[PDB]
Design a protein around this motif. Sequence first.
Motif, PDB file in Angstrom:
ATOM      1  N   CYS A 299      -6.255  -3.911   5.241  1.00 23.94           N
ATOM      2  CA  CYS A 299      -5.008  -3.370   5.740  1.00 23.94           C
ATOM      3  C   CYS A 299      -4.788  -1.961   5.190  1.00 23.94           C
ATOM      4  O   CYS A 299      -3.916  -1.761   4.297  1.00 23.94           O
ATOM      5  CB  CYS A 299      -3.884  -4.284   5.335  1.00 23.94           C
ATOM      6  SG  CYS A 299      -3.773  -4.509   3.606  1.00 23.94           S
ATOM      7  N   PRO A 300      -5.603  -0.994   5.680  1.00 23.74           N
ATOM      8  CA  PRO A 300      -5.589   0.370   5.210  1.00 23.74           C
ATOM      9  C   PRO A 300      -4.221   1.081   5.428  1.00 23.74           C
ATOM     10  O   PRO A 300      -3.751   1.827   4.512  1.00 23.74           O
ATOM     11  CB  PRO A 300      -6.681   1.062   6.020  1.00 23.74           C
ATOM     12  CG  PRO A 300      -7.057   0.114   7.115  1.00 23.74           C
ATOM     13  CD  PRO A 300      -6.665  -1.254   6.670  1.00 23.74           C
ATOM     14  N   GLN A 301      -3.574   0.851   6.592  1.00 25.84           N
ATOM     15  CA  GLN A 301      -2.311   1.549   6.902  1.00 25.84           C
ATOM     16  C   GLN A 301      -1.225   1.180   5.925  1.00 25.84           C
ATOM     17  O   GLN A 301      -0.425   2.017   5.526  1.00 25.84           O
ATOM     18  CB  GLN A 301      -1.824   1.305   8.328  1.00 25.84           C
ATOM     19  CG  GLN A 301      -2.699   1.936   9.428  1.00 25.84           C
ATOM     20  CD  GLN A 301      -3.064   3.386   9.118  1.00 25.84           C
ATOM     21  OE1 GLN A 301      -4.244   3.759   9.068  1.00 25.84           O
ATOM     22  NE2 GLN A 301      -2.054   4.202   8.886  1.00 25.84           N
ATOM     23  N   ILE A 302      -1.211  -0.076   5.509  1.00 30.29           N
ATOM     24  CA  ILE A 302      -0.258  -0.559   4.519  1.00 30.29           C
ATOM     25  C   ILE A 302      -0.616   0.024   3.130  1.00 30.29           C
ATOM     26  O   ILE A 302       0.290   0.407   2.360  1.00 30.29           O
ATOM     27  CB  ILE A 302      -0.300  -2.094   4.491  1.00 30.29           C
ATOM     28  CG1 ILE A 302       0.500  -2.680   5.648  1.00 30.29           C
ATOM     29  CG2 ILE A 302       0.202  -2.684   3.141  1.00 30.29           C
ATOM     30  CD1 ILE A 302       0.098  -4.145   5.934  1.00 30.29           C
TER      31      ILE A 302
HETATM   32 NA    NA Z   1      -3.132  -1.937   8.035  1.00 32.66          NA
END
Ligand code: NA
Length: 57
Positions: free
Chosen positions: A47-50
């Motif tokens: 979950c890169p965006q988080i």
């Molecule tokens: Na993400």
Amino acid sequence: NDIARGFERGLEPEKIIGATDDLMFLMKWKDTDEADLVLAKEANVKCPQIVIAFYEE
Ligand code: NA
């Protein structure tokens, strides 16, 4: 690191609410009031965006 298997619960991440020392994130899960440690190395990928919303803080 065993202290940080939050993902194995199979819930969807929502928001990182904290961190600590191998870098770990306290991850809060979607729609529940629950949080568990997960490894940052692993959250980057899952979950890169988080992960990124946590840094812009
Ligand atoms: Na993400």
